[model samples]
Target chain A: NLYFQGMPLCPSCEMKFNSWEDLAKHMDLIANTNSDKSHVMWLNRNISMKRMEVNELANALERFFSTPNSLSMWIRTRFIERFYGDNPHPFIVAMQNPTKGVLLGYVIEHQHFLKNWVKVLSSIVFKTDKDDVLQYELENISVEFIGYNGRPAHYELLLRMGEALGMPREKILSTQPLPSTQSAIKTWRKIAESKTWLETMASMHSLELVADRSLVKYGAKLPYFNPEILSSDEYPQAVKDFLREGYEADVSHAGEALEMVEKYTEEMEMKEQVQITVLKSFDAFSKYLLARLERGFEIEPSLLKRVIK
Target chain B: GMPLCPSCEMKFNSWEDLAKHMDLIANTNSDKSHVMWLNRNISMKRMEVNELANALERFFSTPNSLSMWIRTRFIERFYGDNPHPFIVAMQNPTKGVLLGYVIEHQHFLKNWVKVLSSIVFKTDKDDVLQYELENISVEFIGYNGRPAHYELLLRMGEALGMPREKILSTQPLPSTQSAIKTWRKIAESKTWLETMASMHSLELVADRSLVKYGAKLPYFNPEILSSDEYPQAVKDFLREGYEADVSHAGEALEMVEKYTEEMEMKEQVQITVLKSFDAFSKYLLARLERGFEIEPSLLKRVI
Candidate 1:
């Protein structure tokens, strides 16, 4: 007997699932209705529940960002680890570079989500190597550096990378450098402990990753790259191929990036939902760090137990 | 040869003919009828003299009234070019002195005795009575207590060469003691009047002392008063005395306690007279101090 039963409907889906497994198949397809979707439509129609949940999470995140004395470095690391699972190194490198780090920190601290997304995208286009990216993100997470000049060197590398990637090199080079996270962390560690490290990294990461994603998405429509013109008619196809490959690469990268982001977001959601106490403790640490910063103190510590884990 | 009288008209061809006519008129008949009529009116002159005598008698009866009349008559007679009978009478020393004595005797016996008694004791300084009496005798012996009449008497006395003492003591009445007593009582009653009279006496004494000192020195008005010439003690005393007089007079006038309408009127008149005197004194002092020769007209005006 073949019974044609529909699948169970997800909160974010129009399609029905026949069973739990069927519903689970479309789990990744569930819409983050709370996400800024003015540009794309990837979510289901019946996403009111998911929308509410996302809204609640966004509200919580907004509240966390609003909290004074937040362990910004820890928060940033945790957020990167959770929402950008592949690596936090890119963000770390961007933050460790004097100019870019300042821009990144400003974007994250001020919750300039759209501008941060642009910054991140610009960073990726410019600083493309996986090691540089990992190093940058890890730097933000741990704030490790050798000297005052290290931050400028890191930013100079970013600018050179920007020039090489054919990004807006002039704009990136003109920006004033951010204070070194390494120095800030070292200063902070002198005042606080490793517990603060986890908290600051987590908060900083969350703010930076989310804000960077928003900025990147906002600037995606802008022409970051252009095809080189050719004289031969045959070169049109080559140019087209080149552009198509680039587009495909970008799409694949976007998918990977989204997957990593989803993984990190899921981890964050788990922490937010399950490890409320840890989150609260991190929140307290964030408050303490913010208070210390307000009093003109800076702290640094070795990376705490993975905030995202 | 017979010539025509000058009174008659005559025709003559030459000087010898005119001289003949004048000799002829010299023996002409005169009219005696007009002359007899003029002789018949000679008794009118006696009547006029009798009428004047009666008027004079009426005048001498009341001293104040007679003095007032005399003053008015004097102003009318001597103030202009034409002279009245009284002015003409004054020209004769014997008649004028006799009339002045008669009027002044009446004034002293009746009005002056009482008024002077009321005023003399009011002199503030003890020495002023005799000093003022001397000046009064010199200036107003025949005019008794009347200031305007006294001026006339002084002028007459100057012309007659009559010493002030003899003329002033001529009528030495029996009421002199009573008059002095009355004056002393009035002066005691009003401290202001007494002080004023005393100030006048002090001024007289100061002038006398200055004159005595001046005779010994070069007799300059400046040297007598200035600290440069006078001994410091003398100068100080004079200055202090002068200041005291001015202060006392000012205070007394200001603090006149009570004022009747009559008193106020009298005060106004007195103030006017005093102001005029002060102006005259200042003019004299200025001339004296500056050693400037005064114009004859100005000197006449002051005199």
Candidate 2:
């Protein structure tokens, strides 16, 4: 009857404990005393990690890029461990499954994605994109100038990166993007049109903060792309120049990106809106990246077993 | 790898079916050792039933046996007459608890088959493979007699006079009714490696034991010690587990250590193992809960 009560009683020794606190006390003691470690510990122990966000979307991106996840850790170790070797990391295998001209279809399609983001920015810039009625105008002007209209425009870099990656200008003009790439853009379109201007701007900031940092890290040509590779006469000089310059420029642009977020959103509640946007955008980015990996929209739930240190 | 009929090497689509075909022909082959055993104890003799039932009560009176009794009872004790809903639904098999025993071995077979196929054989662990294959079969191939769990179920089923149709008829409790389906859904979604970790968790929870020196138990069932019948071969199968459960559960746990090299995977493995036992515990509770509600008409045969 004691065992059948579904009580949190001890599996060993059979002392009936009334609450979790008491149960855990004996569980911990027994766990410590048991040298063989055959004892089953109480299930209530948990570690809590919080994700921080706001117009300081920069910090949000920092956490996203820096925090450890099993998937991303795998990517980092693979890239870092074989940082200089010719042996293809599985990360590279996933990315450059085919070569430049073949892969450019996705890049070119992605370039179209950049233009759409610009359009979304234009649609929101003047409409309601500011923290205050008057402040909106100045912020909108900065967005317009900094985006497609300026040298800091990301599309120009992306197009150049494509050319550097070895897509012929004419062939790039002819290719279409992969479905997953387009699918991500379609979600962004909804994000651009459906939200309040503050929501759109904050969400946009998180994406850029994430997008820019990710490209800078992943698309760069230092450890992953060897200068020694240049000596071998394998890749074109144009491709090397694009990668070397493009990612480094994004690193610089990251500074500009933050200044824009700080410059525009000034009030506490408005800043709060920015943080929520980072949160919503971070979730979207998770799915977006998975789609890029061709895993699809639905994440299959995985709860595996592991108890040891 | 295809499961071949151990009898003729005629390939079948599933191991359950392969075992079924072999079991089917056992009736036709009419072999002497089997027939001799069958002749000696084929009927439901009242004295035999009483003696065995007394032995069951006496065996369960011991501490270790009572521990197992309480443990399985806990499986069904999901917070009173109910527990995990999926486990609850799966618990209501029409054949009652008998199929749970048979299908456990069956689940063991299906799960192992999928696990082995998914691995790159060249790089697979020798220890895990050898351990599971030994469970699948002790014979060189699965001919003659086999320890493969599916074969174990069939032999035990027959010794109890449970024919093929009855065994097969006791299909998985409706997936809608039990935690098994829900647990399986979560399991299927995971990677094969993660699923293997989950499986290892299941094995780690299992334990076994033996009769005392000059035993009071004269051929008692091991899986369900309270069985109403025990053909000699069936009794041996139950005892087989009593001797090996502790070492087996321990080995299953050690594999969880090896297969999961990372802290996160191991963490998930721990959680997974908990769910496995949790689901089982709930299923068992549901079985008992539903069992309590049954009408007396089915209890008419008091043999």
Candidate 3:
């Protein structure tokens, strides 16, 4: 009865559901997908994506991680790089304009989202009220609070970037919605409000893993970081470090994180199903980026004379 | 009584008070629309010179060689340095475009005429127009009225989310006229005295006039940070004018005092300076009158 284009079919049992709720019997099994089968399900936690890699188990999903490069590399080369294809990429024009700011402009949506990250855990329609998984989910909150003790690390990065772009925190926080990007933000909101707990987990995990390859790494690759511009000591070190991390963080994080994705779906039937959910997330994430990149390419290219070839 | 800001609702009681406030706030927003306004304004200011350039046709045979030299000095100062401000604000983004482009390209284009007219009006035999025109090609792109200052304004207006149709139909915001509507009218006739006085007073007063101006603007070069946010391109244009304004005004004062030995030339120069100031003052009051019209609801604001 289920033939969703990307719907995962259990390789072991060949099960599909017309609606996720129609498969309520399977809902209680959210735990089998966790890192430790003995402990109620939760992702393999770490301080940074890499800090826990050494102690973690050999990923049970190792076969799925990079085999045939189905999702990770597929999305990386196709969506991220292609979306960012233009040399003086779109973001360069928007951010450097110093007039119309980037999406980060107007801290309006972010303040609502950053603190609400835990909402992701709560929104899912879980089959069981397993205390262990709930505890694991609660502990994940510590990850966000890690460096500056929640909000600091990420907030500082956003602030530094805003400044480097000639947009101060005040302005970035006030950026008006542009026709180019706000609609996509709403789409993701709808997905979060409606998708299942498993679907949410799968969608999000796939994105975080892929984002390391695309979004965060973008700045490091841009001409904006021209060594001449940066080392001249005009921009702050925080500015330099922000993109530096964006470029490098995924190097260690993506693989470790990608390898563990299957642990979140240990049920053999769930494995194929989660993969579909993740691929769907990848598509959504890619689509969002495509919108931005298309915007960048479509904006006046003469603005590009700033980047010396 | 004062008017409320059309966009943010901050209110002021005088035209220059509001002009100063409006002008200062102009490039502050990171929004795309404001940047577009800056680009158009700079472009508009630059083109305003062409108006003078056209008027210079009548003055080529008129200036004392001394004043001719002074005008040349003024031209070099503004158009000179590594293209000074142009280099700064060019990568310079403002209001969906570059205020610097207006400064470096079109504003300087006016000087080309001034360069030749100063020479033609008084002394230059040949090399003067030739060399100066050559220098003009170096600094900014030749947008070739591929844009107008106002045209660029519409571009920015749209970016900040204005209805394109509304943005395209803009006027100089009603109360605005060069310096002020009064002077604008004076200059509209392109009166000889107003023209010279405009040349003198506008230039002489620039350092102060553009201080707040050059201090802050959208994407203004960081090098100018210590002084003001004024885009560098506009600064170079203003600096050249500022220095010359002070220099020309002083020399004119001395020329008037000394040339008065002739009775005729003294009054000729003297009268021009006098009315120019009148034009200048009246324009300021007119601008202040504009503050009376400021209404928050009339200004652009985003959702």
Candidate 4:
């Protein structure tokens, strides 16, 4: 009964083990313990060890989000695929078959959404101790005002898109949002004001997925819109330009938020709250999208049917 | 005509009547006094500022209140007849001295964003968060078409014969580095209220409201801006802050006062405020240290 296949000895304590499994389990126990320095030193020498670096979480978050195969990249590239696999969101459908009403509704609802966005991001920027997150947010915030790389502000681009669709600037600025759009804005505002930064981050950033260019990689057959629209002479150039900028901007923006959520959710142990908030956000997003579709159908019942012709 | 309460402008037939009115306004929810204070502070619109005034009046009635302490004990130390050394040095600055001031300040401004953001992160109250958001978004980035405060400061540096590269590349004095580290620690680990007191209490250095708080002199004489001794960039920088810091410090103190009253955090906040003032006093000395070190010839001029 005492016959052993091999003797597996504990390196630090010199306690002998009869099986590899026993030794492996003992090593795991010691690895997680607050053991003395000698034990840790011996373990570090004998086995490959990765110590938690002393870098601040802010710096770690910045680096992590930028890495390939990072949670942000997955959120940007793959999680989006799993999010809306087969049923392409209705807003995507609306984009391919554009009508004046759909475009008008899109701009009006977006104005409210964008304003609320500033409030939420500003709140997060003020609340988070992470400098990287602060930098990331301010950079995004600047895009709406000062812009970058010679592009106009994102809000300016949206205004131009509205003008291309024949919605006057005054109307776009002053028009009230739909009931569903209003609720969505309020819901997001409340979440930001009341929730953890990680939860609020997931809630706000997940919506940016609507504009991700890699939607096709994630099973979105209609990649935000028919890609041909970019080169097509038929669609208004401003309309195409807005989509192009969003596609470019939100891919990174979405990735940044998701990476942050992934990193901190594990760190803070707020996975349940994060997941719940993200789903709630998505649900709110779905309602707003349907509102856009309804606005389109209201103006032209045959808006989508026109694609057949 | 009858005498009136200085703050709310309520008419009283006698001095005793006015004193009683002020006392009553503090203890009782007198609507007339509320409306008068609202009219003084805001238009017949939002009640937020009115609520702040109500709190301020109540706290100010207590002679030993934090509000009074800030206006008296705190303001008197630096702004009294013996003004802070930095303030004295700035009144007649050589280019070398100005360069020294700007270099240390660049480091301070760079780290300031994180400090304010940390407070923003720590505060859960919507009003405070909203106030800080306005401060961060409008003050740091610019608001309604104004340039950022830091940008204005940089321009002043450029005019002082300091290039952006030179200003940014120069390391801060050891005293300055340590002070900034202390502030960063306070903002990082302290309560939001403590952080709030710590951060905004220092804005008193440049706040135009200092005279109202009984300062012996302005931070620097406004005429210094128009003096041929300075350049246009310097004028613009000083003028912008002259107007802005009043509201910045005033509104921030208003928030501080409101929270201190309701939470009964008066003593603790006062302690934090004192610590901030001390660090700031050291910061002021640090600003002048370089000036004196670089131009020993001007030593008698400042001292």
Show what share of the native A-B interface contacts model 1 retains: 0.00
Clash pairs, candidate 4, are A81-A218, A126-B120, A126-B121, A127-B121
Model 3 Cα lDDT, one tens digit per residue, B1-303: 354333344556643454454455554666543233324222223223344333222232234443443333233223233222322322333432332123122322332223222221121212322222222222111122233233343343444444556433333333233434344333334333323334443343333223232322222343443355543334443334333434435554344333334343422442344334444343333323322233232112210
Models ranked on lDDT? 4, 2, 3, 1
DockQ of each: 0.00, 0.00, 0.01, 0.15
Write model 2 residue lDDT over B265-300, tens digit each, in one string: 533443344445545554444444433334233233
Model 1 achieves a DockQ score of: 0.00
On the 0 to 100 scale, the lDDT of residue A281 in model 2 is 51
- Per-residue lDDT tens digits for candidate 3, residues A251-272, read 5555443443444444333545
Stretches > 4 Å off in candidate 3: A1-151, A209-234, A266-268, A290-301, A304-309, B1-303
* Native contacts present in each candidate (fraction): 0.00, 0.00, 0.00, 0.11
Q: Candidate 1 chain B TM?
A: 0.22
Candidate 2: CAPRI quality band: incorrect
Tens-digit lDDT string for candidate 4 (A1-309): 435523544545556665545655655566567855544554453233654332332233223223344445544543354335555666666677566777766777787677677667765765675767777777666665556645687677888989988878997787777888878877787787677777777778878888778666656667666677778887788888777887677777676678777888767755434544665676577777776666666567677566335
Error of 4 at A208 (Å): 3.3
Interface quality of candidate 4 as DockQ: 0.15
